[PDB]
């Protein structure tokens, strides 16, 4: 709850900074007066590589176990599949401009 | 639903009159709520007031079916006094069908409603009298 106290203090002080930015000047003086496809490919590309990152990233917590051969095997299989997806969109001229 | 149909069959046949009609109006109001829910959720009647009108009309007709069915059920059971025939409830289902034809204002269609609702009421009383297991045994 200590970090909740930190989040609360930072949020409240930042809101006070925003209200100093807005409601400070008391001198109320004079009030006066299409999308593309290739944007969308980048987001889903990021999304699927992020999902395979989520699959990869608990690797170093796993490094203390006995079945080292299967670990190294499926780890190389995961990075290889990720690079195969990248090479697939690379050779099928997908993310090009 | 289940508890109030069990209330209806708990009322003997037998003469515990117009509680039978209360239970039958409750059954008809439930069935009218079912079919009215389908008819308002599958149509968009444009607008909400007309939807409430269609639901009230459907529930009123179905409760009228149940009411007049239970009334002539009690009338057969008190006048002719044969408690365990399918014939009285054949007459009862015909009465419910003819009053449905009255509330929809169609005559030959009301006669068809008489025929089919009387045969279904005869089936219900007849199979319940002999004892025919609903929906399943479910054993083998």
């Amino acid at each position: 709850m200590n970090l909740m106290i930190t989040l609360l203090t930072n949020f409240t002080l930042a809101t006070l900074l925003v209200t100093i930015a807005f409601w400070l000047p008391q001198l109320n003086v004079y009030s006066e007066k299409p999308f593309s496809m290739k944007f969308f490919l980048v987001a889903i590309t990021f999304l699927l590589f992020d999902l395979e990152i989520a699959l990869l990233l608990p690797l170093p917590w796993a490094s203390q176990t006995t079945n080292l051969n299967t670990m190294l095997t499926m780890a190389l299989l995961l990075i290889f599949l990720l690079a195969v997806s990248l090479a697939y969109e690379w050779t099928q001229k997908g993310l090009e401009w | 639903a289940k508890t109030l149909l069990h209330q209806y069959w708990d009322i003997p046949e037998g003469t515990e009159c117009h509680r039978k009609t209360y239970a039958a109006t409750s059954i008809g109001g439930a069935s009218g709520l079912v079919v009215s829910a389908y008819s308002v959720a599958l149509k968009t009647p444009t607008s909400f007031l007309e939807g409430v009108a269609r639901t009230g009309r459907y529930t009123f007709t179905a409760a009228a079916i149940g009411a007049i069915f239970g009334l002539t059920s009690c009338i057969s059971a008190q006048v002719r006094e044969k408690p365990d025939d399918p014939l009285n409830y054949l007459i009862g289902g015909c009465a419910g069908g003819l009053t449905l034809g009255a509330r929809t204002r169609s005559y030959g269609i009301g006669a068809a409603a008489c025929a089919y609702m009387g045969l279904t009421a005869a089936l219900v009383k007849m199979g319940q009298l002999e004892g025919w297991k609903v929906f399943a045994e479910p054993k083998v």
């Binding site: - | 199979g127 025919w132 399943a136 045994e137 479910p138 083998v140």
Partner: protein, 347 residues
């Protein structure tokens, strides 16, 4: 697309349904359903019209919410007695949600609103593969989880599926909606037995799959989607007429023909219980869903509709189509009356 890419995607449909078949775990079953969805999307929209776009949209929304409701049922099952084994559940509510999720998954009459709409605006290969494998996948799960189901759900969905698949179609002339309504009716027949003896359900599944393959192969004999095209198939070739005749009449369920065998044996192992009102209701509606079959027959197989020239132009050219396996499946799916004791092949 590429042919190698289609090899890979159909391989993944095979792999997804096999993972549904093979695991004793729940997560792999849900992954198999999801991979089935993900790989069956690009088989639809194989052409480039917005018809297939809206069909794929409807299919994705219904398919996705069915998978999510299934995962809800599994997590409720582990809120109660906790293991990931595919056996009897431990909640009426979880089994209730699970049968409803599988009912949205395959298509019952409360949930059948997406099936004709997705099967119309798609090419025929997509419709064939979705019908065969999407009715093949959940029946394995139902076969495994059967001893924990309240009979009111399966019974109500089965009765309602048979009667709505009967009553729909009598206004309909598009052949894909006709075949989808027939799919709803046969899935109701496949469902109504499962709490009594599931061997009949998987046998009816085999028979219906072979019949559907023969049906859509004879609809792929040439590019036809309406009945008047079938009248042109009458005047361009005589053998397609009698083959469509016999396959339609086997979908009808007549005793000297193979499609009667799933009906009658279901009636038998139904009525070795005291169920009589249910067979007579199901069989009167099985009389009902033969009328659209019979008006298709009366249209383009035994009456002779007037045709149009340039069929004269079409007479010069051979039928250079490919058939996956047409005649084998046809005569195996029609003349299979005296092999009724191949019931026991299924154990």
């Amino acid at each position: 697309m590429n042919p190698i890419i289609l090899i890979i995607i159909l391989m993944t449909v095979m792999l997804g349904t096999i993972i549904v078949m093979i695991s004793t775990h729940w997560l792999l079953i849900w992954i198999g359903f999801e991979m089935n969805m993900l790989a069956i999307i690009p088989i639809m929209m194989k052409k480039h019209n917005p018809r297939a776009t809206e069909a794929s949209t409807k299919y994705f929304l219904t398919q996705s919410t069915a998978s999510m409701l299934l995962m809800m049922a599994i997590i409720i099952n582990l809120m109660f007695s906790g293991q990931w084994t595919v056996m009897k559940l431990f909640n009426p509510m979880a089994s209730m949600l699970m049968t409803m999720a599988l009912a949205m998954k395959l298509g019952m009459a409360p949930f059948h609103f997406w099936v004709p709409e997705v099967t119309q605006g798609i090419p025929l290969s997509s419709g064939l593969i979705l019908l065969t494998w999407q009715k093949l996948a959940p029946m394995s799960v139902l076969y495994q989880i059967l001893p924990s189901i309240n009979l009111d759900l399966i019974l109500t969905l089965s009765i309602l599926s048979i009667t709505i698949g009967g009553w729909g179609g009598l206004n309909q002339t598009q052949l894909r909606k006709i075949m989808a309504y027939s799919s709803i009716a046969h899935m109701g027949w496949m469902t109504a037995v499962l709490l009594y003896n599931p061997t009949m359900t998987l046998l009816n599944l085999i028979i219906y799959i072979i019949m559907t393959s023969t049906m859509f192969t004879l609809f792929m004999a040439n590019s036809t989607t309406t009945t008047l095209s079938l009248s042109h198939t009458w005047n361009k070739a005589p053998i397609m007429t009698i083959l469509v005749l016999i396959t339609l009449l086997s979908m009808g369920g007549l005793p000297p023909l193979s499609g009667f065998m799933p009906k009658w044996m279901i009636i038998q192992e139904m009525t070795k219980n005291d169920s009589i009102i249910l067979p007579t209701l199901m069989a009167i509606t099985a009389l009902l869903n033969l009328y659209f079959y019979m008006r298709l027959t009366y249209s383009t197989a035994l009456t002779m509709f007037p045709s149009t020239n340039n069929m004269k132009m079409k007479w010069q050219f051979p039928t250079t189509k490919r058939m996956t396996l047409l005649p084998t499946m046809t005569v195996l799916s029609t003349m299979l009356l005296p092999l009724t004791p191949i019931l026991s092949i299924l154990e």
